[PDB]
Each structure stands twice: as structure tokens, then as C-alpha cells.
Amino acid sequence: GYSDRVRQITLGNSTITTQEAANAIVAYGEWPTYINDSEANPVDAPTEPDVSSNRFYTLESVSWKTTSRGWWWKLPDCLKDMGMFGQNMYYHYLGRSGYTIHVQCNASKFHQGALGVFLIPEFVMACNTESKTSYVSYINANPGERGGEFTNTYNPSNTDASEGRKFAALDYLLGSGVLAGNAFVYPHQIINLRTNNSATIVVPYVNSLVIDCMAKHNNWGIVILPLAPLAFAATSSPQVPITVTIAPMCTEFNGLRNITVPVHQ
Amino acid sequence: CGYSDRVRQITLGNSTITTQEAANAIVAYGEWPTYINDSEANPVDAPTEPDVSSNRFYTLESVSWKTTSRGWWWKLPDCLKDMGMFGQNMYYHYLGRSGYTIHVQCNASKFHQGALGVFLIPEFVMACNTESKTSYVSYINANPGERGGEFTNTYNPSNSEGRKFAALDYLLGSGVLAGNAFVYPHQIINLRTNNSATIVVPYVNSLVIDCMAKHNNWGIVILPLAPLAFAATSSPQVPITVTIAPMCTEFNGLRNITVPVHQ
Amino acid sequence: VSQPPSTQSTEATSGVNSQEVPALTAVETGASGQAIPSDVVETRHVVNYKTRSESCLESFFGRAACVTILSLTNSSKSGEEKKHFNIWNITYTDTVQLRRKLEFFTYSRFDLEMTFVFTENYPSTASGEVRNQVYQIMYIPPGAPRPSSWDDYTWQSSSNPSIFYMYGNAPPRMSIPYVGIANAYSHFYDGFARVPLEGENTDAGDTFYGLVSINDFGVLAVRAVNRSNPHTIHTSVRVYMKPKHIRCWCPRPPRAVLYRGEGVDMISSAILPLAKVDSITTF
Amino acid sequence: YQTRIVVPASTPTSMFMLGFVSACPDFSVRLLRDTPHISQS
Amino acid sequence: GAQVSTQKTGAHENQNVAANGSTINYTTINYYKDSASNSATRQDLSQDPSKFTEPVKDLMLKTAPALN
Numbered sequence: 001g002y003s004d005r006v007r008q009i010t011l012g013n014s015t016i017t018t019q020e021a022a023n024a025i026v027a028y029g030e031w032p033t034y035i036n037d038s039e040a041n042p043v044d045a046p047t048e049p050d051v052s053s054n055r056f057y058t059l060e061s062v063s064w065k066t067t068s069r070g071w072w073w074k075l076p077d078c079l080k081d082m083g084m085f086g087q088n089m090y091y092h093y094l095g096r097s098g099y100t101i102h103v104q105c106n107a108s109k110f111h112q113g114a115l116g117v118f119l120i121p122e123f124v125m126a127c128n129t130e131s132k133t134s135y136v137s138y139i140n141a142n143p144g145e146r147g148g149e150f151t152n153t154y155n156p157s158n159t160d161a162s163e164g165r166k167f168a169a170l171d172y173l174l175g176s177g178v179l180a181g182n183a184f185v186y187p188h189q190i191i192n193l194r195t196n197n198s199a200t201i202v203v204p205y206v207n208s209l210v211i212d213c214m215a216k217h218n219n220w221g222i223v224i225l226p227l228a229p230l231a232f233a234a235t236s237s238p239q240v241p242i243t244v245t246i247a248p249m250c251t252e253f254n255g256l257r258n259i260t261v262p263v264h265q
Numbered sequence: 266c267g268y269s270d271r272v273r274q275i276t277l278g279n280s281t282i283t284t285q286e287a288a289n290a291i292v293a294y295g296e297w298p299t300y301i302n303d304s305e306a307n308p309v310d311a312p313t314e315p316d317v318s319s320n321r322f323y324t325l326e327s328v329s330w331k332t333t334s335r336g337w338w339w340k341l342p343d344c345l346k347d348m349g350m351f352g353q354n355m356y357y358h359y360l361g362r363s364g365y366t367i368h369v370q371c372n373a374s375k376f377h378q379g380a381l382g383v384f385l386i387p388e389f390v391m392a393c394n395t396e397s398k399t400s401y402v403s404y405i406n407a408n409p410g411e412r413g414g415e416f417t418n419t420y421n422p423s424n425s426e427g428r429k430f431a432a433l434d435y436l437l438g439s440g441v442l443a444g445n446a447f448v449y450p451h452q453i454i455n456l457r458t459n460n461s462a463t464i465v466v467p468y469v470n471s472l473v474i475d476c477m478a479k480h481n482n483w484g485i486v487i488l489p490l491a492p493l494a495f496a497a498t499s500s501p502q503v504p505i506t507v508t509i510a511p512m513c514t515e516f517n518g519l520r521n522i523t524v525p526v527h528q
Numbered sequence: 529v530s531q532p533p534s535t536q537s538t539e540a541t542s543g544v545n546s547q548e549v550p551a552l553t554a555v556e557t558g559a560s561g562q563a564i565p566s567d568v569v570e571t572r573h574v575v576n577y578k579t580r581s582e583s584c585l586e587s588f589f590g591r592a593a594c595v596t597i598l599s600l601t602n603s604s605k606s607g608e609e610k611k612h613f614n615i616w617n618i619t620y621t622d623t624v625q626l627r628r629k630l631e632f633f634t635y636s637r638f639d640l641e642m643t644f645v646f647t648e649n650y651p652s653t654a655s656g657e658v659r660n661q662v663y664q665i666m667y668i669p670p671g672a673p674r675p676s677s678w679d680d681y682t683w684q685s686s687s688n689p690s691i692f693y694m695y696g697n698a699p700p701r702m703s704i705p706y707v708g709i710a711n712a713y714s715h716f717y718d719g720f721a722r723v724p725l726e727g728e729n730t731d732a733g734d735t736f737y738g739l740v741s742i743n744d745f746g747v748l749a750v751r752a753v754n755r756s757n758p759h760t761i762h763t764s765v766r767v768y769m770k771p772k773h774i775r776c777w778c779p780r781p782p783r784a785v786l787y788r789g790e791g792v793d794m795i796s797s798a799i800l801p802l803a804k805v806d807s808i809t810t811f
Numbered sequence: 812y813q814t815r816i817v818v819p820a821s822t823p824t825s826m827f828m829l830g831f832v833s834a835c836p837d838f839s840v841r842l843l844r845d846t847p848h849i850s851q852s
Numbered sequence: 853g854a855q856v857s858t859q860k861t862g863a864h865e866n867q868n869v870a871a872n873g874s875t876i877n878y879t880t881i882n883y884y885k886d887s888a889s890n891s892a893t894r895q896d897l898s899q900d901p902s903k904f905t906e907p908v909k910d911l912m913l914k915t916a917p918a919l920n
């Protein structure tokens with residue numbers, strides 16, 4: 001027979017194995033698919049890479065300390081320089097993709113703590129100034145693979161234009177005014193260190209359009225929260241890494257133009 | 266109904282071995298020991314088939330796995346020469362043939378690490394520890410009994426210290442790199458997952474049957490592949506116990522008991 | 529016409545999200561990993577027409593190798609009469625390339641093709657007229673009498689195989705059927721030729737260890753059959769062997785270090801087969 | 812390293828792994844040459 | 853009493869099919885009665901790698917965990 005805990009995910013030129021996963025989630029019960037002719041918007045001849053963009057990429061790792069309040073990513077953004085997925089989103093005006101999101105975090109049996117991994121469509125976050133609304137720079141809004149962080153202090157500045165262009169990423173309100181305890185409405189999986197060392201979520205493209213412009217819109221974001229604190233009891237300050245590995249799937253593009261080169265720092 | 270490859274019960278004669286944690290079992294070359302067929306036989310004398318008397322497991326003296334150990338050496342029909350009826354029959358009969366079940370045992374806690382490769386080598390011929398003459402080893406040193414011998418990591422040939430084997434670990438005692446030891450039927454006791462290994466051994470020779478007092482058709486080699494380690498101490502020790510049974514034992518030609526040079 | 533079997537073809541395959549895990553296994557089991565590219569990456573359909581022809585044991589072994597070189601001296605000097613003929617122990621041991629291939633297996637059974645090659649020159653500073661030479665290669669089975677001299681009676685070869693070669697003709701050649709007493713030749717023998725018994729206890733003197741003590745294939749007695757001439761001829765006789773119709777058993781690794789003699793003995797000056805690498809991360 | 816190796820209390824912090832290499836089923840060779848790894852005088 | 857068999861595909865023989873034409877054949881006659889005198893045996897690619905690469909008593913599957 002086969003266990004539920006043990007699994008192998010293969011896409012493109014890459015494979016991820018795991019021996020401790022709580023199955024896998026297919027958000028809303030649907031798999032990424034290619035656009036059906038009957039729903040297509042553009043009349044351009046689409047580009048459909050098979051095994052170029054559709055491979056797993058590993059994002060820069062983050063560290064889980066007992067003082068972290070969480071981490072976040074905008075999904076298309078976190079893969080913007082990732083080989084061919086990166087190049088195709090900049091060469092084409094339009095693009096669409098689903099994703100396989102795999103989150104990894106090791107701990108020993110003497111460790112405790114839990115990470116909630118949530119995928120939030122349209123993960124819109126609040127500005128960090130009380131003098132303006134819906135105010136955030138392109139650059140701060142789209143940090144890349146680095147992601148961003150959550151805090152537990154709301155310290156807006158109604159006078160400092162620079163800080164006001166950063167997000168007000170409160171952990172308990174998920175950066176947008178919603179209590180985190182209701183985050184569970186979104187597809188999610190929990191990396192409870194006494195149960196799992198990983199989580200996998202399959203993500204369909206979800207939008208009001210069949211296809212959109214990737215340099216403008218982040219279809220989904222990734223939120224990871226320390227639902228339960230990390231502890232080891234054999235140290236004053238334990239630390240374990242968290243690594244997020246992502247593959248686009250059933251990817252297509254249209255609107256070929258000169259490569260887009262966004263404002264950056 | 267809950268059966269698992271992880272556990273096993275091996276019963277031969279009046280001896281049973283149970284295992285809770287092992288990686289299947291190996292049948293070398295895909296073959297089981299069998300008796301000599303009428304179509305392939307040299308001796309004329311009716312054979313002696315001790316059956317259940319000799320076909321039982323015997324336990325060889327254990328050895329300690331130290332963090333400085335380089336390996337252990339046994340010859341198979343030799344290590345059993347003084348063990349029960351199998352031992353007596355090989356001395357009484359000129360010719361003999363047998364297969365074997367080799368079971369290597371090594372328990373450790375979950376907090377210990379290390380690994381032992383267990384290899385069975387047909388014709389395990391070893392180099393001598395002298396440069397004065399080649400192929401020069403005493404009968405006694407080449408046939409240590411259940412005590413076995415050990416591998417070293419240095420070579421210091423003499424110019425009596427010479428008439429013994431130059432048992433280098435990295436060259437398997439014969440000038441052959443150990444990484445290729447895996448060519449031979451083998452199993453690994455990885456303390457992470459197993460506490461034992463089992464290999465079924467067919468009789469292997471260029472002959473149907475041979476003289477056991479002269480020829481060791483199989484040898485047993487155990488090497489650390491990864492060192493023993495335990496956080497609580499610089500000198501953890503884990504005993505390794507080797508348990509062996511003959512299979513399908515057959516003998517031919519009854520003479521006076523052979524008594525080889527002893528010590 | 530029957531097409532020889534090819535090596536494994538690759539089927540096309542797509543992505544996987546299942547509980548099956550071809551990539552994870554155990555080797556503790558004694559088994560090698562069994563994974564192929566279709567188990568870990570997406571693949572295309574490739575038809576494989578390649579065969580393992582050169583890797584067959586017949587192909588691997590089917591090359592003549594020089595095994596030994598014998599030295600014959602045809603001379604008018606009385607002090608060199610004893611060198612007019614020579615005797616060699618038949619073995620493959622003398623040359624590394626052939627014993628190395630044979631030592632990949634513990635046992636083997638084969639027929640043997642032998643070819644001899646003769647080369648001659650004048651070792652002297654003063655060369656001169658010499659008539660064309662003829663050579664005799666006589667096989668002397670174990671237990672058969674050996675010549676004490678080049679003109680001894682044993683050269684009559686009444687019972688022994690003997691091949692005569694006139695210098696300058698095509699190199700002489702013959703086929704020898706498997707002659708082992710056992711049902712295969714053993715390339716290794718972990719044992720003694722004789723069991724020393726209680727009452728004669730010594731360490732030294734046990735020179736009976738290894739296959740070297742139980743293998744006697746006779747000798748090749750090679751003779752110039754010509755009368756001595758005023759100008760000395762020095763002849764090099766190369767002995768070649770080609771195992772054929774070979775079956776092998778119980779594979780073992782090849783030797784990493786240089787051989788010392790007939791057994792498996794190591795040389796203390798040469799037990800270091802690998803090169804140093806600058807670092808584990810070198811590439 | 813992916814993530815990191817995590818070791819619990821009173822457990823060794825220096826681990827080893829053994830790498831192995833082998834041919835796959837889709838594998839062959841084309842032509843013999845003398846081996847460069849051994850010699851004699 | 854000659855035997856006829858098939859030659860290894862040559863340089864201009866572009867069929868990897870190895871079954872095209874009657875021109876890919878060769879004839880062998882044995883001239884000696886002692887079998888040791890005969891030429892090399894016919895190539896035989898029969899193999900059984902499992903004998904050495906997976907000599908496991910119990911059935912092992914690639915997809916199933918090796919240890920269950």
C-alpha cells in the first residue's frame with residue numbers, strides 16, 4: 001500500500017518528495033487548466049511553454065525565530081526573475097498561470113510550533129500612512145522572492161512620505177483589517193511541527209478575467225503565520241528555516257512586445 | 266492482514282531468529298541452497314545429509330563497534346568449524362557442501378548514528394603482511410575461527426609477523442577499493458532504519474563439492490561505512506553479533522577425523 | 529531475420545502529484561536504486577536502437593593479449609648452450625592487462641586461442657651470415673618429462689603436442705579446449721593446497737595458500753631447432769592468448785593497485801590508487 | 812542544503828551520507844580501449 | 853553443411869532495423885571437428901541484471917516505499 005504522508009510531485013525538470021505531508025489541497029476543488037476556446041478574450045496566438053516555466057523554483061529562505069510575526073509574498077511577483085517564467089511574464093503583456101505551492105519547514109520531535117500557510121487571492125494590503133489611502137509604491141508593493149514580513153505594531157506615519165509607501169503589515173489583521181483567525185476561509189494547510197514538515201497547495205488561476213497583465217496584478221499572495229510559537233527547550237532562542245518552493249503550471253501568454261522592465265531598486 | 270517487510274521470523278532446525286527492524290532479506294544471485302542433483306555429481310559414495318542436526322544457527326563471538334574500528338573479518342566455513350555438529354561433520358568428512366544464512370545483528374538507540382556494510386565475498390583471498398614472499402600466510406592465521414580477525418588502516422609488512430593477512434580496510438585486504446565492495450551480495454545496517462541484515466548464500470564454487478578443511482568458499486566482511494557516533498560520549502560502543510546457519514548441508518567420504526594444525 | 533534486443537527506450541511522461549514515490553527507496557535492502565528519467569523528470573518518447581554489443585563478455589574478452597615474452601639464444605659459445613631453449617610456466621599472471629580483465633570474475637570457463645610471434649636480432653657487435661631459423665614449441669603437460677637440454681630426447685614429442693614454425697611465415701596459432709579439472713577455472717582460491725595436520729605446527733612453510741598452489745597447466749618448452757651458427761641469434765618469443773566462448777561467474781571489482789607476483793599481494797610503495805582533489809566542492 | 816539539517820538535543824551534529832553511482836537501463840558503450848589505470852614495468 | 857546468419861550493420865547500411873535485404877548475411881562453415889576450433893559464438897544479448905542489482909527475497913516495487 002501507500003501512505004498519505006509520503007508523496008512525490010514532478011513537474012518539468014524538477015521533483016519534490018516528502019515523507020511528512022498532510023495530503024495536499026486543491027483549492028476550490030479545481031486544477032489549473034488552459035483557457036478553453038469558448039472563454040478566450042485575446043485573439044492572439046498564445047504561447048504555451050511546456051517544461052520551461054513549469055518547473056519548481058526555490059525562493060530565498062526565511063528564518064523562523066520565536067519573535068517572527070509572519071512572512072508574505074505576492075505570487076507572480078515572487079517568480080519575476082525565475083528563469084523562463086520570469087522572462088515570459090516580462091516579454092508578454094498578458095499571461096496566466098496556476099501554481100503548485102510547496103512550503104517546507106523541518107524540526108525535531110522535541111520542537112513545537114505551527115505554521116499556517118494560506119493562499120489569498122487578491123491579497124490587498126493597507127498603506128502605512130494615515131494621510132493617504134491605497135498608497136504604496138510599486139517597489140514596496142512588489143518585493144520579489146524576498147517577500148515581506150508581518151509585524152504586530154501599527155506605526156503609520158502621517159508625515160513621513162517614505163514609510164507611508166510601505167505596507168502596514170499587521171499580523172493579527174493580515175495587513176488588511178481582517179482578523180487572522182478567519183484566514184482559514186482561504187485554502188490553507190498547517191505545518192504543525194509534530195505532524196508535518198511540509199504543505200502543498202494546488203492553485204487554479206482565479207480572476208474576473210480569463211487572462212490579465214502580470215506586471216500589474218498579483219493573482220494570489222502567500223501568507224505564512226506562526227499560529228503556534230516555536231520552542232525547543234534546549235536553547236534560549238531556537239531557529240528553524242522556512243522555505244517556499246513554487247512552480248507555475250498550465251501557463252500561457254499573449255501580447256508579445258518588448259521586454260517590460262519595471263521600476264526597481 | 267498487517268504483514269510487513271520490516272519484520273521476519275527465520276526458523277531453521279531448532280533455532281529461530283526474529284527481527285523487528287530489517288530491510289527485507291537478500292538471496293545472493295537469486296538462488297537458494299539446494300542439494301547436489303544426480304545430474305551434477307562427482308562423489309560416488311552415498312551422501313550424508315545431517316539435515317536438522319547441522320542446519321541450525323550458531324552464534325559467533327560478538328565484536329564491539331568502536332569509533333576507531335575499521336572492520337571485521339570472518340571466513341564462513343571456518344568460523345563454524347568448531348560449532349556443534351556442522352563442525353564435527355566437516356572434520357569427519359573429506360568433502361562437503363553447504364549454503365548459509367548469514368544474519369548480522371547490531372542494535373543502537375535512535376540517538377546513535379553510523380552504518381555497517383555487510384558483504385559476502387566468494388573466494389575472499391587476502392594479501393599477506395610480508396614482502397619477502399607472496400601468497401605466504403600460515404594456516405592458523407588464515408583460519409581464525411569464530412573469533413574472526415580485524416581490518417586495519419595501515420600497512421606494515423614485515424621483513425612470524427609476516428604470516429598473516431594485510432587486512433587494509435580501504436583496499437578490502439586485497440588491493441581492491443572498498444567502494445566497489447557493493448558488487449558482492451551485500452546489505453547495510455544503517456542504524457537510522459535497521460538493526461539487522463540477512464543474506465541467503467548458495468554454495469558457490471567451480472566444483473560441485475570440495476574439501477572444507479582446505480577451502481573457504483565464502484568470506485564475511487563487515488565495514489563501517491559511516492562511523493559510530495553518539496552525542497553523550499567520545500567512546501560509545503555497540504556490540505555486533507553474527508549468527509550463522511548452514512543450509513542444505515551435504516557431506517561425502519568418511520575418514521578419520523581430520524585434526525588440523527592447532528595453535 | 530531477428531533484430532538483436534536494444535537497451536531501454538524512454539516513454540513519454542507528464543507531471544505527477546501522487547503518493548507513488550519512485551525517487552525514494554532504501555539501499556539497505558541490498559538493492560540498487562531502480563529509478564530511470566521517466567520517474568523523476570518529464571520525458572519525450574525516444575526509441576532506443578542501441579545494443580550492448582561491445583559490452584558482451586565475448587566481446588570484452590575476445591582480444592589476444594600478450595602474456596609473456598621468452599628469450600632463446602642460438603649460439604656457438606659453449607657457455608650459452610643452456611640458453612638455446614627455454615621453459616615457461618603457463619599462466620596469464622605475467623601480464624597485467626589480461627589478468628585484470630579475467631579478475632573481474634571469480635570463476636570462468638573458456639576455450640583458449642594461442643598465437644606466437646617471433647622476433648629475432650643479433651645481440652653481438654659482429655653480425656654475419658646466418659641461415660633461416662626454425663622454432664619448436666612443445667607442450668609438456670603436468671607430470672610429463674622436461675628436456676634438460678635443447679637436444680634432449682623429450683623434444684621428439686611422441687606424446688606431446690608440438691608446433692613447428694619456420695621463421696618468416698605467418699605467426700603459428702592453435703586452439704586449446706577448456707582443460708580445467710574443475711567445472712570452471714577458479715581465478716581465486718581462498719584456501720590451501722594441503723591441510724597441515726596437528727603434529728607439524730609452523731607458520732613458515734605454508735606456501736600452499738592461494739590458487740597458485742593448485743594450478744599446473746604444464747609448460748611451454750621452446751627451442752631453436754637449428755645448429756649453432758658463428759653469429760649469435762637472440763630470439764624474442766611473444767606468447768599471446770585470447771579467451772573465447774567464455775562464461776563467467778560471480779563478479780567482483782577490478783584491482784585498484786599494482787600487482788605483486790602471482791597472488792593478490794600489495795606493494796607497500798603503491799597502495800594509493802586515487803588522486804587528490806582540492807576540495808569536496810571542486811567540480 | 813535545502814532548509815537545514817535539524818538535530819534534537821543529545822544527538823550528533825555531524826552526519827554523513829554515502830553517495831552511489833550506477834548506470835541506468837538505457838545505457839551502453841561503443842568501443843574497447845586498454846584501461847589507463849594499471850601498469851607494470 | 854554451411855550456416856547462414858546476419859552481419860553487424862555496416863557503415864552504409866542505414867537500416868537499424870537489421871532486417872533489410874539479403875545482403876546483410878554471411879556464411880560460416882566449420883572446418884574442424886573439435887569445437888574449440890570454431891569461431892566466436894553468436895552474440896547473445898540476453899541479460900538478467902536483477903541478479904546482481906536487486907537480489908531481494910521479497911518483491912520490491914519502484915513506487916511502493918522500500919521499507920513498509
Ligand SMILES: CCCCCCCCCCCCCC(=O)O
Nearest residue numbers: 665666667689690691707713745
Ligand atoms: C604445442 C603447444 C600447446 C600448448 C597447450 C597449452 C595448454 C594451456 C591450458 C590452458 C591454460 C589456462 C590458464 C588459466 O585460465 O588459468
